[PDB]
Amino acid sequence: HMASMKHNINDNTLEIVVGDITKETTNVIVNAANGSLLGGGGVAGAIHHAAGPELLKACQEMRNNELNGEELPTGEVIITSGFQLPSRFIIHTVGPIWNQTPDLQEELLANCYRNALELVKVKKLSSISFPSISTGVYGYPIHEAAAIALQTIIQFLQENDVGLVKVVLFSERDYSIYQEKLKYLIEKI
C-alpha cells in the first residue's frame, strides 16, 4: 500500500514515502554503506544491483584514491555517479553501529544527514532521497533513528535553501513510525 506525506519547511519540501529508493528520480540518492564502500545491508545490495557494475568500480577508486585505502569514517560522505539508476548521483555514507560509541552515536548518525545535505547545497543539486540509515534487525532502534533523522533534516532545512528532501522507506511499518514522529515534530516547531 503506497503512502506519502509532504510538509514545506520554508521554501524546502520534506517528504516521507513508502518505496524503492533505487527507482527514485531525485538528483541524488543516499547509500548507507559499510566503511569499505563495497557492501552494506539492505538497500546497499539493491543499489549496487540497480546501478550496475560500474558503481562498485567507482567505489573501489574512491577507496583507493580519495580515502588512501582506508574505510570512510562514520558520518562522512562521498559522492559518485548513479550510473544505471534513474538518479544522477549517489552520496555514500556510513552510519554508526548502534551502541559501539553510545555517547557519540547521535551526532554521528546526524552527520550522515547533515553532511549529505551540505554537499547537495554546495553542489546545487536540488533533490535528494535518504534511506533509513543504520536500522535493521541488529541495528539502531527505528524510533530513535527516525527522530534523529527528521530532527536533523528539519533543522537543516530551517537554516538553508536546498529543495526537495525525501525519506524513502521500504517498510510500511517504518513509514508509520516516521509519520508519527514527523507529526509530533511539526506541531512543536
Numbering used by the authors: -3 to 185
The publication says:
Macrodomains are ubiquitous and evolutionarily conserved modules (approx. 130–190 residues) that recognize ADPr derivatives in their free form or linked to proteins, including ADPr, PAR, ADP-ribose-1″phosphate and O-acetyl-ADPr (OAADPr). To expand our knowledge concerning the field of macrodomains, we have characterized Oceanobacillus iheyensis macrodomain (OiMacroD), the first to be described from the order Bacillales. A yield of 40 mg of pure protein per litre of culture after a simple two-step purification process was obtained. Its phylogenetic analysis revealed that, among the six different classes previously described for macrodomains, OiMacroD is included in the MacroD-type clade, together with other previously characterized MacroD-like macrodomains, such as hMacroD1 and hMacroD2. The subunit has a mixed α/β fold, similar to that of other nucleotide-binding proteins, composed of a central seven-stranded mixed β-sheet (β1–β2–β7–β6–β3–β5–β4) and five α-helices.
To gain insight into the structural and catalytic role of residues N30 and D40, the corresponding alanine mutants were constructed, instead of more conservative mutants, with the aim of completely abolishing the catalytic activity. Surprisingly, these mutants were active towards OAADPr. However, the 86% reduction in catalytic efficiency found in D40A mutant was basically due to a 4.4-fold decrease in kcat, accompanied by a slight increment in the Km value, which was also observed in its ΔTm in the presence of OAADPr compared with the WT. To gain insight into the role of this residue, the D40A mutant structure was analysed and compared with the other OiMacroD complexes, allowing us to identify the presence of two different D40 rotamers. Interestingly, in D40A mutant, the absence of the H-bond between D40 and G36 structure caused a major displacement of the β3–α1 loop of about 4 Å towards the distal ribose, occluding the distal ribose binding site. This conformation was stabilized by a main-chain interaction between residues G36 and N30, which is made possible by the absence of the D40 side-chain, allowing the β3–α1 loop to occupy part of the remaining free space. Soaking or co-crystallization of this mutant in the presence of ADPr yielded no complex. Hence, this study suggests a novel role for residue D40 in the stabilization and organization of the β3–α1 loop, maintaining the proper conformation of the distal ribose site for OAADPr binding. A rigid body outward movement of 5.5 Å (hinge in residues T131 and G135) takes place when the active site is empty, yielding a fully open conformation, as observed in the D40A mutant (salmon). In addition, D40A mutant revealed an additional structural role for this residue, apart from the catalytic one: maintaining the proper architecture of the OAADPr site through the organization of the β3–α1 loop.
